[PDB]
Each structure stands twice: as structure tokens, then as C-alpha cells.
Design a protein around this ligand. Structure first.
Ligand code: SF4
Ligand code: SF4
Length: 281
């Protein structure tokens, strides 16, 4: 039942090792790596590992970012090409130190990946760029297969532990991406102190904002400096939340102990893609 080491994981590992490629998969010790790499899916981080913001559940440290590296989009595109990925997720940090909030860096990375990797689905997980319409438009024009912006938690909690964001602004990002014609995605992290009723209302908020794909996961505390875990969600409770989201009309729903945002991202995109094409007939 549990994924064990297969031939495509092995190929990818060999290619990563020789070229010295950085992946979030390896660097973060993600336990899904045997399964994801067997499906040739992987995740990359752009913009450095020092974020200009601080959200209490997030393992990324807050600090002074390094200078913009304009060679990073090519580096990521080359990694995707070397690995022969079927699906690639591009993540990053907030860059309030940059005058465009890093919008060029995100767009240029999607563009570079697509130039070299025509058959690779690309998922872009973005910060909010302060909801600035010109920044969002630059990013949307790069045309990722999935545009994700994770709200992570419910408004009561969001307000406190993501103080450089606002819940309605983040919903607005998803709406802007949907309006731009992109498949959209978000994530809820349970165990942060939210009530089940707050999860149900947040799923409704996400759907009404235009969100197509939602993941619902269990919080795993990064360290004793981070937010405490306030609940361990039972399998039957995840199933209820997934049914709730399915009933709301989300095209793709995954609930459970997913560990990271990118788990099964390729399969969820395929579901959303297929359902959109079916509806468009
Ligand atoms: S869940 Fe994400 S980070 Fe973990 S192995 Fe899969 S693609 Fe990589
Ligand atoms: S969730 Fe995003 S903005 Fe918040 S600390 Fe993590 S990387 Fe930075």
C-alpha cells in the first residue's frame, strides 16, 4: 500500500544528484517524494528562502532577501527539462523589498519553463502581490496551467497570524485569476484553531470567489517557535469536508494529511482540465 522506490523516482534522483538540482521535495524532506517523483512531479522555490513577511504556520523564515537573481527562471526551467517532469510547481516567498513584488520573477519562471517544456503542466503558487492589478496581470499573462494562492486559514485566524495579508484581498486574487481564464486553486490548513463551521464557510467563500481546486490538510507544526496545533482532524472528518467541497461544485478536491501543498497536484489539474473541457463542449 505505501509507495516504495520505483524506476522513475530512481531516474529522477540520479539526474538531480549529478546536476546538483535543488527541489523543495528533497530539501524539505517531504515524505511524498517516492510517489510524486514516480509520477514525474516536483516542486521548486524561487526568490530565495528569506521572506519579507511572517505567517505563524509557515516554515519559511522571515529575513532580508538576497538581491533578485535574474538567472533563476532559466535555472528552474533547466531543472524541469533535466528531470523530464510531467508536472512542475513553482513556489516562492513574498518580496516586498522588490518594486514589483517579484511579479517579473514569477512570470519569467513560468515562461522559461514552458519554452523548454511544452508537455509539462505548470502550477504557480503565488503570494498576493498586495492585490495590485498590474502585478497580477503580468503573472497571469505567463499562463500557468494552475494559478494557486493559498488562504490557508479562516478569517478569524487569518486576521491574527497573517498580518501582512487580508482574507478578502486573498479571495480577490483568486477571483482575478479566474476572471483571467486560469484554473485556480487554494489550500486550507486545519488544526490552527478553526471550527468546523468556519471551515465550511471558508470553503463556500473560496468557491464563490471562483476557486476550482481545493486542498484541505493537517497542520504540522514546523517548530516550537510556530503556531501550536489545536486539533488533530480524523479521517472521517476530512471525508466530510471533502464531500462538502465536492457538493459546492469544486472541480478538484483532496482532503487528508497531505503534508505539503503540491501533493497530487498533477492529478487534480487533470481533473479540473477535463471537467472544464467537458463543460465547454
Ligand atoms: S508533495 Fe510536493 S514537495 Fe512533496 S514530493 Fe510531492 S511535489 Fe515534492
Ligand atoms: S506563507 Fe508566504 S508570505 Fe507567509 S511567511 Fe510563508 S512564504 Fe512568507
Amino acid at each position: 500500500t505505501r509507495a516504495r522506490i520505483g524506476p522513475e523516482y530512481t531516474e529522477l534522483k540520479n539526474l538531480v544528484r549529478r546536476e546538483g538540482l535543488h527541489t523543495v521535495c528533497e530539501e524539505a524532506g517531504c515524505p511524498n517524494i517516492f510517489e510524486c517523483w514516480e509520477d514525474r512531479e516536483a516542486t521548486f522555490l524561487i526568490g530565495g528562502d528569506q521572506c519579507t513577511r511572517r505567517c505563524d504556520f509557515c516554515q519559511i523564515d522571515t529575513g532580508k532577501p538576497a538581491e533578485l537573481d535574474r538567472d533563476e527562471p532559466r535555472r528552474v526551467a533547466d531543472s524541469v527539462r533535466t528531470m523530464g517532469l510531467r508536472y512542475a510547481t513553482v513556489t516562492g516567498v513574498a518580496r516586498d523589498d522588490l518594486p514589483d513584488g517579484g511579479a517579473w520573477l514569477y512570470a519569467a519562471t513560468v515562461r522559461a519553463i514552458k519554452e523548454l517544456n511544452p508537455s509539462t503542466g505548470v502550477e504557480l503558487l503565488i503570494p498576493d502581490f498586495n492585490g495590485e492589478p498590474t502585478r497580477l496581470a503580468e503573472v497571469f499573462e505567463s499562463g500557468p496551467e494552475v494559478l494557486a494562492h493559498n488562504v490557508e486559514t479562516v478569517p478569524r485566524i487569518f486576521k491574527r497570524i497573517r498580518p501582512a495579508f487580508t482574507y478578502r484581498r486573498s479571495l480577490g486574487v483568486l477571483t482575478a485569476a479566474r476572471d483571467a481564464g486560469l484554473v485556480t486553486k487554494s489550500n486550507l490548513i486545519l488544526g490552527l484553531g478553526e471550527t468546523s463551521d468556519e471551515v465550511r464557510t471558508a470553503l463556500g467563500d473560496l468557491r464563490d470567489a471562483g476557486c476550482d481546486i481545493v486542498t484541505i490538510t493537517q497542520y504540522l507544526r514546523p517548530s516550537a517557535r510556530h503556531h501550536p496545533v489545536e486539533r488533530w482532524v480524523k479521517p472521517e472528518e476530512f471525508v466530510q469536508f471533502a464531500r462538502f467541497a465536492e457538493g459546492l461544485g469544486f472541480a478538484g478536491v483532496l482532503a487528508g494529511p497531505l503534508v505539503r501543498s503540491s501533493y497530487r497536484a498533477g492529478r487534480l489539474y487533470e481533473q479540473a482540465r477535463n471537467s472544464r473541457a467537458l463543460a465547454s463542449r
